[PDB]
Ligand binder design. Structure first.
Ligand SMILES: [Zn+2]
Ligand SMILES: [Zn+2]
Ligand SMILES: [Zn+2]
Ligand SMILES: [Zn+2]
Lengths: 116, 25
């Protein structure tokens, strides 16, 4: 993440078509932008909590479609079942977790990086 | 937990791209 360059951000929310000056509640709200494709969303349109929003703004964040597994760097045939960390929004295939997961976790899920 | 698939659904649809293009320029 420290190494891969960041795409030019699009200053429009892909979900509501507002800018940083107007979200769905007619209020200003800064965008977050995918580092790989540049497409953007308001945290409120992405349904991110304030805490998750703070963490992803400090990371090389990827949108839902661009998200690659932090362990294997792939999307692959099992991409749709990639888990998204509820602390940092990184993606992990279940088979790439440490330890590997046979089944979907229940409730909020925290990845191997965020776990103390 | 969220997966790519469930996050697509729970987030809600993207706006029509033609409308995002009309706005992007
Ligand atoms: Zn929005
Ligand atoms: Zn992207
Ligand atoms: Zn993987
Ligand atoms: Zn995490």
């Amino acid at each position: 993440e420290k190494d891969k360059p960041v795409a030019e951000p699009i200053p429009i929310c892909s979900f509501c078509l507002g800018t940083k000056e107007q979200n769905r509640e007619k209020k200003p709200e800064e965008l977050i932008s995918c580092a790989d494709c540049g497409n953007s969303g308001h945290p409120s349109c992405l349904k991110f909590s304030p805490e998750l929003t703070v963490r992803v703004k400090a990371l090389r964040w990827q949108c839902i479609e661009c998200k690659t597994c932090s362990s294997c760097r792939d999307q692959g045939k099992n991409a749709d079942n990639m888990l998204f960390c509820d602390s940092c929004d990184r993606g992990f295939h279940m088979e790439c977790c440490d330890p590997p997961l046979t089944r979907m976790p229940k409730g909020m899920w925290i990845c191997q990086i965020c776990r103390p | 937990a969220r997966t790519k698939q469930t996050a697509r659904k729970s987030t809600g649809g993207k706006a029509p791209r033609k409308q995002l293009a009309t706005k992007a320029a």
